[PDB]
A paper describes a structure:
Four helix bundles are also attractive for synthetic chemists because its interfaces are dominated by side chain and side chain interactions, which can be more tunable than β-strands. Thermotoga maritima ferritin (TmFtn) naturally occurs as a dimer; twelve of these dimers interact with each other in a head-to-side manner to generate 24-meric hollow protein nanocage in the presence of Ca2+ or PEG.
After trying different molecular weights (PEG1000, PEG1500, and PEG3000) and concentrations (10, 20, and 30%) of PEG, we finally obtained nanorods formed in the presence of 30% PEG1500. To determine the structural basis of such nanorods, we set out to grow single crystals large enough for X-ray diffraction analyses in the presence of PEG1500. The crystal structure proved remarkably similar to the design model: protein molecules connect through designed π stacking and hydrophobic interactions in a side-by-side repeating pattern with adjacent FLAL molecules antiparallel with each other. Thus, the crystal structure is in good agreement with the above results observed by TEM, confirming the side-by-side interaction manner of dimeric FLAL molecules. Taken together, all these findings demonstrate that our protein interface redesign approach yields assembly of dimeric FLAL protein building blocks into the filaments or nanorods induced by Ca2+ or PEG rather than the inherent Ca2+-mediated 24-meric protein shell-like assembly.
Residue numbers in the entry:
A (entry chain A): 2 to 164
B (entry chain B): 3 to 164
The structure:
Protein backbone atom coordinates (compact mmCIF):
# COMPACT_ATOMS: atom_id res chain seq x y z
CA UNK A 1 0.00 0.00 0.00
CA UNK A 2 1.49 3.27 -1.26
CA UNK A 3 -1.83 4.98 -0.45
CA UNK A 4 -2.42 6.07 3.08
CA UNK A 5 -5.30 4.22 4.74
CA UNK A 6 -6.69 7.76 5.08
CA UNK A 7 -6.97 8.48 1.34
CA UNK A 8 -8.06 4.94 0.44
CA UNK A 9 -10.81 5.11 3.04
CA UNK A 10 -12.03 8.33 1.40
CA UNK A 11 -11.70 6.94 -2.11
CA UNK A 12 -13.64 3.93 -0.81
CA UNK A 13 -16.45 6.02 0.66
CA UNK A 14 -16.65 7.84 -2.66
CA UNK A 15 -17.00 4.53 -4.47
CA UNK A 16 -19.84 3.77 -2.10
CA UNK A 17 -21.47 7.17 -2.68
CA UNK A 18 -21.76 6.83 -6.43
CA UNK A 19 -23.15 3.32 -6.15
CA UNK A 20 -25.91 5.01 -4.16
CA UNK A 21 -26.12 7.71 -6.84
CA UNK A 22 -26.69 4.84 -9.26
CA UNK A 23 -29.49 3.46 -7.07
CA UNK A 24 -31.17 6.84 -6.42
CA UNK A 25 -31.15 7.68 -10.13
CA UNK A 26 -32.64 4.26 -10.90
CA UNK A 27 -35.30 4.92 -8.28
CA UNK A 28 -36.23 8.23 -9.94
CA UNK A 29 -36.74 6.12 -13.05
CA UNK A 30 -39.25 3.87 -11.28
CA UNK A 31 -41.13 7.05 -10.48
CA UNK A 32 -40.74 8.47 -14.02
CA UNK A 33 -41.80 5.14 -15.56
CA UNK A 34 -44.72 5.09 -13.13
CA UNK A 35 -45.92 8.60 -14.06
CA UNK A 36 -45.51 7.82 -17.75
CA UNK A 37 -42.38 9.83 -18.57
CA UNK A 38 -40.44 7.18 -20.47
CA UNK A 39 -37.82 9.64 -21.66
CA UNK A 40 -37.13 11.07 -18.22
CA UNK A 41 -36.84 7.49 -16.95
CA UNK A 42 -34.55 6.47 -19.81
CA UNK A 43 -32.23 9.35 -18.92
CA UNK A 44 -32.09 8.70 -15.18
CA UNK A 45 -31.45 5.06 -16.09
CA UNK A 46 -28.42 6.00 -18.15
CA UNK A 47 -27.36 8.43 -15.43
CA UNK A 48 -27.27 5.26 -13.31
CA UNK A 49 -25.06 3.31 -15.69
CA UNK A 50 -22.75 6.36 -15.80
CA UNK A 51 -22.33 6.63 -12.05
CA UNK A 52 -21.59 2.88 -12.02
CA UNK A 53 -18.82 3.34 -14.57
CA UNK A 54 -17.39 5.96 -12.21
CA UNK A 55 -17.38 3.40 -9.38
CA UNK A 56 -15.48 0.99 -11.61
CA UNK A 57 -12.76 3.61 -12.15
CA UNK A 58 -12.57 4.23 -8.39
CA UNK A 59 -12.57 0.47 -7.85
CA UNK A 60 -9.68 -0.27 -10.15
CA UNK A 61 -7.65 2.74 -9.00
CA UNK A 62 -7.81 1.55 -5.40
CA UNK A 63 -6.33 -1.80 -6.47
CA UNK A 64 -3.54 -0.38 -8.63
CA UNK A 65 -2.70 1.89 -5.73
CA UNK A 66 -2.34 -1.46 -3.98
CA UNK A 67 -5.38 -1.19 -1.68
CA UNK A 68 -8.68 -3.03 -1.53
CA UNK A 69 -12.36 -2.03 -1.81
CA UNK A 70 -15.04 -2.87 0.76
CA UNK A 71 -18.72 -2.41 -0.09
CA UNK A 72 -21.15 -1.02 2.46
CA UNK A 73 -24.89 -1.28 2.84
CA UNK A 74 -27.07 0.66 0.40
CA UNK A 75 -30.07 2.27 2.08
CA UNK A 76 -33.44 2.38 0.33
CA UNK A 77 -33.82 5.48 -1.89
CA UNK A 78 -36.80 7.81 -2.13
CA UNK A 79 -39.27 6.29 -4.56
CA UNK A 80 -41.87 9.04 -5.02
CA UNK A 81 -41.57 12.86 -5.22
CA UNK A 82 -44.00 15.74 -5.86
CA UNK A 83 -43.71 15.91 -9.67
CA UNK A 84 -41.19 16.15 -12.48
CA UNK A 85 -39.68 19.25 -10.93
CA UNK A 86 -39.53 17.75 -7.46
CA UNK A 87 -37.67 14.72 -8.82
CA UNK A 88 -35.28 16.69 -11.02
CA UNK A 89 -34.78 19.09 -8.16
CA UNK A 90 -33.65 16.05 -6.22
CA UNK A 91 -31.13 15.03 -8.87
CA UNK A 92 -29.77 18.60 -8.69
CA UNK A 93 -29.18 18.69 -4.91
CA UNK A 94 -27.64 15.19 -5.01
CA UNK A 95 -25.42 16.23 -7.91
CA UNK A 96 -24.34 19.16 -5.77
CA UNK A 97 -23.59 17.21 -2.57
CA UNK A 98 -21.33 14.91 -4.57
CA UNK A 99 -19.69 17.98 -6.16
CA UNK A 100 -18.87 19.12 -2.62
CA UNK A 101 -17.92 15.56 -1.57
CA UNK A 102 -15.39 15.33 -4.38
CA UNK A 103 -13.98 18.69 -3.29
CA UNK A 104 -13.16 17.29 0.15
CA UNK A 105 -11.47 14.19 -1.35
CA UNK A 106 -9.54 16.52 -3.68
CA UNK A 107 -8.37 18.63 -0.78
CA UNK A 108 -7.73 15.68 1.58
CA UNK A 109 -5.61 14.13 -1.20
CA UNK A 110 -3.50 17.26 -1.65
CA UNK A 111 -3.22 17.65 2.13
CA UNK A 112 -2.02 14.05 2.15
CA UNK A 113 0.59 15.00 -0.51
CA UNK A 114 -0.86 12.26 -2.75
CA UNK A 115 0.20 13.63 -6.15
CA UNK A 116 -1.38 10.73 -8.04
CA UNK A 117 -4.88 10.44 -6.60
CA UNK A 118 -5.28 14.20 -6.97
CA UNK A 119 -4.26 13.90 -10.61
CA UNK A 120 -6.62 10.92 -10.89
CA UNK A 121 -9.47 12.87 -9.31
CA UNK A 122 -8.66 15.65 -11.83
CA UNK A 123 -11.08 14.18 -14.33
CA UNK A 124 -13.95 13.87 -11.87
CA UNK A 125 -14.19 17.50 -10.70
CA UNK A 126 -14.47 18.52 -14.36
CA UNK A 127 -16.81 15.63 -15.15
CA UNK A 128 -19.18 16.91 -12.53
CA UNK A 129 -19.13 20.63 -13.22
CA UNK A 130 -20.64 19.37 -16.44
CA UNK A 131 -23.15 16.88 -15.00
CA UNK A 132 -24.67 19.30 -12.50
CA UNK A 133 -24.75 22.05 -15.15
CA UNK A 134 -26.84 19.68 -17.27
CA UNK A 135 -29.22 18.88 -14.42
CA UNK A 136 -29.81 22.52 -13.46
CA UNK A 137 -30.41 23.23 -17.16
CA UNK A 138 -32.96 20.41 -17.19
CA UNK A 139 -34.79 21.91 -14.20
CA UNK A 140 -34.61 25.47 -15.57
CA UNK A 141 -36.40 24.17 -18.67
CA UNK A 142 -39.31 22.37 -17.03
CA UNK A 143 -39.91 25.61 -15.17
CA UNK A 144 -40.70 27.91 -18.13
CA UNK A 145 -42.69 25.00 -19.50
CA UNK A 146 -45.00 26.04 -16.63
CA UNK A 147 -46.88 22.76 -16.57
CA UNK A 148 -47.59 23.22 -20.28
CA UNK A 149 -47.68 19.59 -21.21
CA UNK A 150 -46.95 20.12 -24.93
CA UNK A 151 -43.29 20.97 -24.18
CA UNK A 152 -42.75 18.65 -21.26
CA UNK A 153 -43.32 15.78 -23.64
CA UNK A 154 -40.91 17.71 -25.86
CA UNK A 155 -38.27 17.41 -23.11
CA UNK A 156 -39.22 13.85 -22.13
CA UNK A 157 -38.82 12.96 -25.80
CA UNK A 158 -35.49 14.75 -25.99
CA UNK A 159 -33.78 13.62 -22.81
CA UNK A 160 -35.29 10.24 -23.75
CA UNK A 161 -32.81 9.90 -26.61
CA UNK A 162 -29.59 10.48 -24.71
CA UNK A 163 -27.34 7.62 -25.81
CA UNK B 1 -52.91 -5.64 -15.43
CA UNK B 2 -50.74 -7.78 -13.15
CA UNK B 3 -52.40 -8.58 -9.87
CA UNK B 4 -50.98 -6.90 -6.78
CA UNK B 5 -49.81 -10.31 -5.54
CA UNK B 6 -47.96 -11.32 -8.71
CA UNK B 7 -46.51 -7.79 -8.70
CA UNK B 8 -45.21 -8.08 -5.14
CA UNK B 9 -43.44 -11.37 -5.87
CA UNK B 10 -41.69 -9.99 -8.96
CA UNK B 11 -40.75 -6.80 -7.16
CA UNK B 12 -39.03 -8.76 -4.40
CA UNK B 13 -37.35 -10.97 -6.97
CA UNK B 14 -36.01 -7.83 -8.66
CA UNK B 15 -34.60 -6.58 -5.35
CA UNK B 16 -33.16 -10.05 -4.62
CA UNK B 17 -31.37 -10.12 -7.99
CA UNK B 18 -29.87 -6.71 -7.20
CA UNK B 19 -28.47 -8.07 -3.93
CA UNK B 20 -26.92 -10.83 -6.01
CA UNK B 21 -25.10 -8.38 -8.23
CA UNK B 22 -23.89 -6.71 -5.02
CA UNK B 23 -22.91 -9.94 -3.27
CA UNK B 24 -20.87 -11.09 -6.27
CA UNK B 25 -19.09 -7.76 -6.63
CA UNK B 26 -18.27 -7.93 -2.91
CA UNK B 27 -16.87 -11.42 -3.63
CA UNK B 28 -14.79 -9.73 -6.31
CA UNK B 29 -13.50 -7.32 -3.63
CA UNK B 30 -12.24 -10.29 -1.68
CA UNK B 31 -10.69 -12.01 -4.72
CA UNK B 32 -8.58 -9.08 -5.98
CA UNK B 33 -7.48 -8.51 -2.37
CA UNK B 34 -6.22 -12.10 -2.13
CA UNK B 35 -4.63 -11.70 -5.55
CA UNK B 36 -6.83 -13.73 -7.95
CA UNK B 37 -7.68 -11.47 -10.86
CA UNK B 38 -9.27 -14.25 -12.88
CA UNK B 39 -11.64 -15.19 -10.08
CA UNK B 40 -12.35 -11.49 -9.46
CA UNK B 41 -12.91 -10.83 -13.16
CA UNK B 42 -15.29 -13.82 -13.15
CA UNK B 43 -17.25 -12.40 -10.19
CA UNK B 44 -17.46 -9.05 -11.99
CA UNK B 45 -19.06 -10.57 -15.10
CA UNK B 46 -21.52 -12.39 -12.84
CA UNK B 47 -22.66 -9.32 -10.89
CA UNK B 48 -23.18 -7.30 -14.07
CA UNK B 49 -25.03 -10.37 -15.34
CA UNK B 50 -27.27 -10.35 -12.27
CA UNK B 51 -27.89 -6.70 -13.03
CA UNK B 52 -29.15 -7.48 -16.54
CA UNK B 53 -31.63 -10.02 -15.11
CA UNK B 54 -32.87 -7.36 -12.70
CA UNK B 55 -33.63 -4.87 -15.46
CA UNK B 56 -35.53 -7.51 -17.44
CA UNK B 57 -37.73 -8.09 -14.40
CA UNK B 58 -37.89 -4.27 -14.50
CA UNK B 59 -39.08 -3.69 -18.06
CA UNK B 60 -41.60 -6.50 -17.52
CA UNK B 61 -43.10 -4.97 -14.36
CA UNK B 62 -43.75 -1.88 -16.43
CA UNK B 63 -44.98 -3.72 -19.51
CA UNK B 64 -47.76 -5.06 -17.27
CA UNK B 65 -48.68 -1.72 -15.74
CA UNK B 66 -46.84 -2.18 -12.46
CA UNK B 67 -44.18 -0.13 -10.72
CA UNK B 68 -40.81 -1.09 -9.27
CA UNK B 69 -40.13 -0.18 -5.69
CA UNK B 70 -36.44 -0.36 -4.77
CA UNK B 71 -35.81 -1.70 -1.26
CA UNK B 72 -32.69 -1.38 0.88
CA UNK B 73 -29.67 -3.44 -0.12
CA UNK B 74 -28.13 -5.23 2.87
CA UNK B 75 -24.40 -5.12 3.31
CA UNK B 76 -22.69 -8.11 1.69
CA UNK B 77 -20.14 -10.25 3.45
CA UNK B 78 -16.64 -9.10 2.56
CA UNK B 79 -14.40 -12.03 3.63
CA UNK B 80 -14.45 -15.81 3.34
CA UNK B 81 -11.99 -18.55 4.27
CA UNK B 82 -10.68 -19.22 0.77
CA UNK B 83 -11.69 -19.56 -2.87
CA UNK B 84 -13.87 -22.64 -2.44
CA UNK B 85 -15.49 -21.23 0.70
CA UNK B 86 -16.55 -18.28 -1.45
CA UNK B 87 -17.74 -20.35 -4.41
CA UNK B 88 -19.37 -22.40 -1.66
CA UNK B 89 -21.30 -19.27 -0.69
CA UNK B 90 -21.99 -18.78 -4.43
CA UNK B 91 -23.68 -22.13 -5.06
CA UNK B 92 -25.82 -21.85 -1.95
CA UNK B 93 -26.88 -18.28 -2.81
CA UNK B 94 -28.11 -19.28 -6.29
CA UNK B 95 -29.72 -22.49 -5.08
CA UNK B 96 -31.97 -20.27 -2.99
CA UNK B 97 -32.92 -17.88 -5.78
CA UNK B 98 -33.66 -21.02 -7.86
CA UNK B 99 -36.30 -22.11 -5.36
CA UNK B 100 -37.59 -18.54 -5.07
CA UNK B 101 -38.23 -18.51 -8.82
CA UNK B 102 -40.21 -21.76 -8.57
CA UNK B 103 -42.48 -20.29 -5.90
CA UNK B 104 -43.26 -17.34 -8.21
CA UNK B 105 -43.72 -19.78 -11.13
CA UNK B 106 -46.24 -21.57 -8.92
CA UNK B 107 -47.87 -18.40 -7.46
CA UNK B 108 -48.31 -17.02 -10.97
CA UNK B 109 -49.55 -20.27 -12.45
CA UNK B 110 -52.12 -20.51 -9.67
CA UNK B 111 -53.04 -16.93 -10.43
CA UNK B 112 -53.58 -17.90 -13.33
CA UNK B 113 -51.28 -15.25 -14.81
CA UNK B 114 -50.12 -17.16 -17.89
CA UNK B 115 -48.04 -14.12 -18.91
CA UNK B 116 -45.69 -13.93 -15.92
CA UNK B 117 -45.45 -17.76 -15.92
CA UNK B 118 -44.14 -17.87 -19.49
CA UNK B 119 -41.59 -15.10 -18.92
CA UNK B 120 -40.22 -16.62 -15.72
CA UNK B 121 -39.54 -19.75 -17.82
CA UNK B 122 -36.65 -17.85 -19.45
CA UNK B 123 -35.22 -17.34 -15.96
CA UNK B 124 -35.98 -20.83 -14.67
CA UNK B 125 -33.83 -21.96 -17.57
CA UNK B 126 -31.08 -19.27 -17.47
CA UNK B 127 -31.05 -19.65 -13.67
CA UNK B 128 -30.74 -23.45 -13.96
CA UNK B 129 -27.47 -23.01 -15.80
CA UNK B 130 -26.15 -20.25 -13.57
CA UNK B 131 -25.87 -22.81 -10.78
CA UNK B 132 -24.20 -25.31 -13.07
CA UNK B 133 -21.48 -22.84 -14.01
CA UNK B 134 -20.86 -22.45 -10.27
CA UNK B 135 -21.44 -26.14 -9.50
CA UNK B 136 -18.63 -27.40 -11.73
CA UNK B 137 -16.27 -24.71 -10.45
CA UNK B 138 -16.81 -25.75 -6.84
CA UNK B 139 -15.83 -29.25 -8.02
CA UNK B 140 -13.23 -27.97 -10.47
CA UNK B 141 -12.11 -26.68 -7.08
CA UNK B 142 -12.72 -29.44 -4.41
CA UNK B 143 -10.61 -31.82 -6.51
CA UNK B 144 -8.16 -28.86 -6.46
CA UNK B 145 -7.77 -29.05 -2.61
CA UNK B 146 -4.49 -27.43 -2.94
CA UNK B 147 -2.40 -27.71 -6.11
CA UNK B 148 -2.26 -23.90 -6.23
CA UNK B 149 -0.71 -24.78 -9.61
CA UNK B 150 -3.98 -25.76 -11.33
CA UNK B 151 -5.96 -23.35 -9.12
CA UNK B 152 -3.86 -20.83 -11.06
CA UNK B 153 -4.58 -22.61 -14.32
CA UNK B 154 -8.22 -22.30 -13.24
CA UNK B 155 -7.99 -18.64 -12.23
CA UNK B 156 -6.41 -17.86 -15.62
CA UNK B 157 -9.18 -19.72 -17.44
CA UNK B 158 -12.05 -18.23 -15.43
CA UNK B 159 -10.36 -14.87 -15.99
CA UNK B 160 -11.17 -14.76 -19.71
CA UNK B 161 -14.93 -15.07 -19.34
CA UNK B 162 -16.60 -12.37 -21.38
Amino acid sequence: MVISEKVRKALNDQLNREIYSSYLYLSMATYFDAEGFKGFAHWMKKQAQEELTHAMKFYEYIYERGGRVELEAIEKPPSNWNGIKDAFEAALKHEEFVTQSIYNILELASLALDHATVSFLKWFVDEQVEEEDQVREILDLLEKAFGQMSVIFQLDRYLGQRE
